[PDB]
Design a protein around this ligand. Structure first.
Ligand SMILES: CC(C)CCC[C@H](CCCC(C)(C)O)[C@H]1CC[C@H]2[C@@H]3CC=C4C[C@@H](O)CC[C@]4(C)[C@H]3CC[C@]12C
Ligand SMILES: CC(C)CCC[C@H](CCCC(C)(C)O)[C@H]1CC[C@H]2[C@@H]3CC=C4C[C@@H](O)CC[C@]4(C)[C@H]3CC[C@]12C
Lengths: 221, 15, 233
């Protein structure tokens, strides 16, 4: 890139890409916070078979991954990567991006997540028999809520979750590095322009995204 | 990791 | 090698198609009297090319999903490596959609089941490519002449997919082994049902390819001027 104005064009493009593919608009998530499942509705979910709850969740997770893939395709140089690397980057990082995106759907005031039109807590998922997995991701969402992530910060952050030249299997590792280094500078530049460089120490640590998703990537479908 | 196929199907839904 | 294993392969490939045929033959036939009226056709023709492309791209994308699902259930396909699976489906998935189309094509009145009703090719006027549309309507018409059974479609579209000559395969021997066993299943099942007469009436491998090559050029310029995202199953 070799200039600071091109980096700003990157920042704006990454943020426009995320605005177009964020799936659930933030302002709509916020107004919906007062819309919460009743005890009867929660009980209806808990009586469902694990198989029905898994089919619902697999559906919502597939749709979520689709929006992430669309986000990556719009990242400035992602489509210039060979097809192998685009697949490697997405299969390694799309779950993690989905987990980062979940903090927008998460209400820390009552520890509920937007699920199928309303907010509910983790007891909504009891039939899955996955208390610790579900509990791990509400807690992680709870941590990220404290950062009060803006939309552009999430955009820039999830771009770096995907464009990670450390993913094993990459055929053109150098190309991804140039993409990664420029996105990193964009992230740091943008944080200084908004006086938000304090988040850089508060982000989730190395491999905490990987470890949380690697605990979930084990399921029979 | 998502399977390579599903990830291909998200990338190119029509090919 | 035994005929017991070939017959089991037949039964399995047929079961896979039944579960991924997307539209039940019974429903397509029962819906034949449900035709778009002149005004509804006018409504389709008044649409912009972009609105027609978005709808068509949506229904095609859904069609591909069912074809991918059918592939995954073919005995031995998921034992191929990830690269060869991708190679076979991208060379073949559209060819399979073109074959599957003849189930939704009524030869009596030259209509296709599209979005709930039957209509002729005049439905797609807004797209501005009546030559490409005529080609696939005529190809469907020819396949309809054959009265493909559901199991003939299943076994024939399996071999459209499982083609060891696709460029870029890494384990061509493993695909060769799959293609041969499917050829045995297809040829045996034609004898069991006394349908060996369709082998010579099928379109050669080049006609599916040439017909789909004619459309993929218009589909990629249309997809990159504005794309589409569709829910899965
Ligand atoms: C690493 C995680 C991301 C894994 C998904 C967790 C959870 C269900 C897990 C079931 C299992 C059997 C695997 O244990 C899924 C189910 C539905 C998902 C939500 C669907 C839609 C959205 C909208 C999107 O804008 C942000 C993310 C969010 C809220 C998903 C979060 C993950 C959920 C709850
Ligand atoms: C098979 C392809 C080689 C040809 C696609 C033709 C057409 C769109 C053409 C627009 C273009 C700009 C490319 O000229 C598509 C659009 C919608 C498609 C149908 C949707 C669903 C089904 C059900 C499935 O069970 C069998 C096939 C069928 C009928 C599709 C046929 C092809 C259609 C009409």
């Amino acid at each position: 890139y070799a200039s600071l104005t091109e980096i700003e064009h990157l920042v704006q493009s990454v943020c426009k890409s995320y605005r177009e593919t964020c799936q659930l608009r933030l302002e709509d998530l916020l107004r919906q916070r007062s819309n919460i499942f009743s005890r009867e509705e929660v009980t209806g979910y808990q009586r469902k078979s694990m198989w029905e709850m898994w089919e619902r969740c697999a559906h919502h997770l597939t749709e979520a991954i689709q929006y992430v893939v669309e986000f990556a395709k719009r990242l400035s140089g992602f489509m210039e990567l060979c097809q192998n690397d685009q697949i490697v980057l997405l299969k390694a990082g799309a779950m993690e991006v989905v987990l980062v995106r979940m903090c927008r759907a998460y209400n820390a005031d009552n520890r509920t997540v937007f699920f199928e039109g309303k907010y509910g807590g983790m007891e909504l998922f009891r039939a899955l028999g996955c208390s610790e997995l579900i509990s791990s991701i509400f807690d992680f969402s709870h941590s990220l809520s404290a950062l009060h992530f803006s939309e552009d910060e999430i955009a820039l952050y999830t771009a770096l979750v995907l464009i990670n030249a450390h993913r094993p299997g990459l055929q053109e590792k150098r190309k991804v590095e140039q993409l990664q280094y420029n996105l990193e500078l964009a992230f740091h530049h943008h944080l200084c322009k908004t006086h938000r460089q304090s988040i850089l120490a508060k982000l989730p640590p190395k491999g905490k995204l990987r470890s949380l998703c690697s605990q979930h990537v084990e399921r029979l479908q | 990791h998502v399977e390579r196929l599903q990830i291909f199907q998200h990338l190119h839904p029509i090919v």
